[PDB]
Amino acid sequence: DGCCSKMGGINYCDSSAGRLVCNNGFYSTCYCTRHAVMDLQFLMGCCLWHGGVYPQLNSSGLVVCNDGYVSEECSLQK
């Protein structure tokens, strides 16, 4: 919807702060650029805090990480 709702409207995006600026001179509550201040704690993926996903397409369903740790819950089960 309208990020600068009940305001002057969308004027321009500051990329040094990653935020839109309303026509009334206030920082908006929407971001425009990726390189801003996020606050996210939930993350996807597996082999995390490890070597990442090992890139080889293994025949077996067990997928290992590059640092050597085995992630069976990321893998399938028998």
């Binding site: 990020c3 009940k6 509550t29 971001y31 996210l40």
Partner: peptide, 18 residues
Amino acid sequence: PKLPCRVDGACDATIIKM
């Protein structure tokens, strides 16, 4: 769906109204 579009719990219309 991973990147948040805005900061949650922030509606500037409600800010001005309150």
